Design a binder for this molecule. Structure first.
Ligand SMILES: CCCCCCCC/C=C\CCCCCCCC(=O)OC[C@@H](O)CO
Ligand SMILES: CCCCCCCC/C=C\CCCCCCCC(=O)OC[C@@H](O)CO
Ligand SMILES: CCCCCCCC/C=C\CCCCCCCC(=O)OC[C@@H](O)CO
Ligand SMILES: CCCCCCCC/C=C\CCCCCCCC(=O)OC[C@@H](O)CO
Ligand SMILES: CCCCCCCC/C=C\CCCCCCCC(=O)OC[C@@H](O)CO
Ligand SMILES: CCCCCCCC/C=C\CCCCCCCC(=O)OC[C@@H](O)CO
Ligand SMILES: CCCCCCCC/C=C\CCCCCCCC(=O)OC[C@@H](O)CO
Ligand SMILES: CCCCCCCC/C=C\CCCCCCCC(=O)OC[C@H](O)CO
Ligand SMILES: CCCCCCCC/C=C\CCCCCCCC(=O)OC[C@H](O)CO
Ligand SMILES: CCCCCCCC/C=C\CCCCCCCC(=O)OC[C@H](O)CO
Ligand SMILES: CCCCCCCC/C=C\CCCCCCCC(=O)OC[C@H](O)CO
Ligand SMILES: CCCCCCCC/C=C\CCCCCCCC(=O)OC[C@H](O)CO
Ligand SMILES: CCCCCCCC/C=C\CCCCCCCC(=O)OC[C@H](O)CO
Ligand SMILES: CCCCCCCC/C=C\CCCCCCCC(=O)OC[C@H](O)CO
Ligand code: NA
Length: 475
């Protein structure tokens, strides 16, 4: 498939998974409310949750796919075995350590939590810790499927874990908090089993010979692909340091922002890796293609999400004691983050294009520029300008990183940028004309209308592209 179609499929599958994640969270609130036991569950799943998130955004494939795709036969099998064996040894050590030093682990991941929460989290850790083994294997299978140009089904697999956790939550009336905890572990196992064929179609070897060279690429690419996780941790701690009272606003804005980020900032960047890795001589053609598609996703989503940020925050959060005044500040933080969406999309797409040809140094430089710029801007301006300033600093840091990366690749599809921007402005105009009611659900219709208007006028202004695609099909 084309980068556009594979990226749409990635985003659709991700959306479906995230819908079930929303239902999972709704049921948590229903079956546990605010209880220290749910807090213990969240501590216990923090690290595996983190691993699944970052691997789902390419932190494993960036190093695995370019080395795996360039090998064949016995070599390919021995590479895959080296990676599995190497990480299995590490993961075994980590799980054993967590079983012997649970207080240390929980003190690390559960700092600031109450005593009773930590005591329970130490028990639940015994159930959640082994999940990292199945998350790692899932990520390897995921990478292999991507190498074969398969993106929809891999991106749908988190649905499996969400369903198992939902089931465990339903069963918590009889069994309590251990039930969703076991659901989390079972979910990780079933996610891997659903795509186990990708691994076990290879022959297994008792080797680790390729593991050191793999790690040489894994370290910088992992750090490059987790930069936004770092920015989030930095932002949270700066806001917590400067203004305790604002941390919930930042958390709520960030929590929602994860949706458009996962749908639109890392879709093309996931697809472009295997596209270029399997056709490395056409790096520049595929990169420009991917940059166009990245903009095609991120510019209209930025524009529409900013216009609808207040109705979005209101719908999800304006209940109970969360007033319209809380909605206002939170929506402003969300806007500040959303301004960065196309820049983090471009950063991810260029970084992954470099990874495809095994250039880890240039994106690692960019990652260091982004993360350090964010830290510095957070500290300098966090006190005066509050959580809005902190969120805006994250977006500005992304701009700085993108400027470095664009100067490195020496290319940008300016004409398509202008066409996409115009179509996004036409979309915004129509959304504005439909903005005539305070009804709390209307923004959902407005999102649908926005998508349809954008696609309709995209088809008008990309008519030659469509004409060719249509005739190529008919031929
Ligand atoms: C190659 C380098 C690999 C080195 C690994 C470095 C750090 C590993 C992180 C240590 C953390 C290992 C803890 C195991 C776990 O899954 O705990 C679950 C928690 O969520 C409970 O709260
Ligand atoms: C691989 C899978 C191995 C996992 C099984 C190992 C150990 C099971 C440990 C079970 C730990 C279960 C703790 C549940 C609990 O204490 O609930 C009480 C709360 O509701 C109130 O505090
Ligand atoms: C196929 C999908 C299956 C998904 C299964 C999801 C969740 C499994 C829930 C099993 C939970 C059953 C736990 C039994 C237990 O030991 O309870 C002890 C507690 O009462 C006190 O600590
Ligand atoms: C469903 C899609 C509906 C309308 C799409 C209109 C055409 C959209 C084309 C958007 C720009 C683009 O991505 O250019 C590079 C392409 O080669 C990507 O492969
Ligand atoms: C550079 C392009 C950036 C943005 C263009 C979007 C224009 C849209 C401006 C939206 C107006 C607004 O801020 O409303 C308040 C929010 O809370 C929404 O409810
Ligand atoms: C280079 C990477 C990091 C440099 C960190 C700079 C280290 C210096 C931190 C100074 C600071 O944060 O002061 C805050 C005061 O207002 C106390 O409230
Ligand atoms: C309000 C919008 C009104 C637009 C009115 C007239 C312009 C539409 C017809 C002309 C627009 C087509 C632009 C073009 O050259 O597309 C080729 C494709 C390349 O892939
Ligand atoms: C709703 C639309 C659901 C889209 C399903 C498309 C699909 O199943 O795609 C799998 C195939 O591998 C595509 O190449
Ligand atoms: C709201 C909408 C909810 C949609 C949830 C749909 C399905 C849930 C279970 C789907 C199971 C995940 C697919 C498994 C898979 O990816 O199989 C790939 C195959 O093994 C490659 O060889
Ligand atoms: C995966 C299978 C079992 C998960 C562990 C289930 C064992 C945890 C239950 C321990 C208990 O005493 O309850
Ligand atoms: C389920 C939660 C815990 C799971 C923890 C992981 C489970 C697997 C355990 C150990 C892997 C050991 C793999 C053995 C592979 C070693 C091969 C080897 O050492 O080869 C050396 C060769 O001579 C030169 O390359
Ligand atoms: C390297 C430069 C490190 C950045 C040093 C910033 C420390 C600082 O000056 O923080 C001031 C802040 O505005 C107080 O509210
Ligand atoms: C081009 C016209 C585009 C119209 C959109 C710009 C006007 C606007 O954003 O108005 C905000 C609204 O009044 C409250 O969110
Ligand atoms: C509301 C409904 C909006 C319908 C809009 C467009 C349908 C377009 C159908 C043709 C799909 C165009 C695909 C395309 O242009 O693909 C480029 C890629 O390079 C190919 O390999
Ligand atoms: Na920031």
């Amino acid at each position: 498939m084309s980068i556009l179609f594979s990226s749409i499929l990635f985003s659709i599958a991700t959306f479906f998974s995230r819908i079930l994640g929303l239902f999972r969270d709704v049921l948590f609130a229903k079956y546990f409310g605010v209880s220290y036991e749910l807090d213990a569950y969240f501590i216990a799943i923090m690290f595996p949750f983190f691993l699944r998130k970052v691997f789902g955004e390419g932190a494993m494939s960036s190093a695995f796919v370019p080395l795996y795709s360039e090998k064949s036969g016995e070599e390919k099998d021995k590479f895959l075995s080296s990676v599995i064996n190497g990480f299995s040894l590490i993961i075994l050590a980590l799980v054993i350590l967590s079983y012997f030093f649970p207080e240390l682990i929980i003190n690390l991941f559960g700092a600031g939590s109450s005593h009773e929460t930590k005591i329970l989290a130490k028990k639940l850790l015994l159930i959640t810790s082994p999940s990292i083994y199945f998350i790692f294997l899932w990520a390897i299978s995921y990478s292999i499927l991507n190498t074969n140009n398969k993106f929809f089904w891999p991106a749908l697999t988190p649905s499996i874990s969400n369903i198992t956790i939902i089931i465990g939550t339903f069963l918590s009336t009889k069994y309590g908090i251990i039930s969703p905890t076991i659901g989390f572990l079972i979910g990780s196992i079933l996610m891997f089993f659903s795509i186990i064929k990708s691994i076990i179609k290879h022959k297994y070897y008792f080797t680790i010979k390729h593991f050191p060279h793999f790690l040489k690429l894994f370290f910088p690419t992992f750090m490059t692909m987790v930069v936004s996780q770092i920015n989030t941790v930095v932002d949270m701690n700066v806001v917590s340091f400067y203004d305790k009272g604002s941390i919930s606003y930042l958390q709520y804005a960030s929590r929602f922002y994860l949706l458009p980020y996962g749908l639109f900032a890392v879709s093309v960047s996931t697809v472009v890796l295997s596209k270029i890795s399997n056709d490395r001589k056409n790096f520049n053609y595929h990169l420009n293609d991917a940059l166009k598609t990245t903009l095609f996703f991120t510019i209209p989503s930025m524009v529409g999400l900013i216009f609808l940020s207040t109705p979005i925050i209101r719908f999800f959060y304006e209940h109970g004691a969360f007033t319209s005044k809380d909605t206002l500040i939170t929506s402003k933080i969300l806007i500040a983050y959303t301004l960065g969406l196309p820049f983090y999309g471009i950063y991810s797409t260029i970084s992954r294009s470099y990874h495809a040809i095994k250039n880890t140094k240039t994106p690692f430089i960019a990652a260091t520029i982004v993360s350090l710029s964010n830290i510095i801007l957070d500290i300098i301006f966090g006190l005066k300008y509050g959580p809005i300033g902190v969120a805006l600093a994250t977006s500005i840091a992304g701009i700085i990183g993108v400027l470095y990366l664009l100067f490195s690749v020496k290319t940008f599809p300016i004409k398509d940028f202008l066409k996409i921007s115009l179509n996004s402005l036409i979309m915004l105009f129509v959304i504005y004309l439909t903005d005539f009611t305070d009804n709390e659900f209307w923004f959902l219709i407005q999102i649908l209308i926005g998508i349809l208007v954008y696609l309709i006028f995209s088809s008008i202004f990309y008519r030659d592209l469509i004409r060719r695609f249509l005739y190529a099909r008919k031929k």
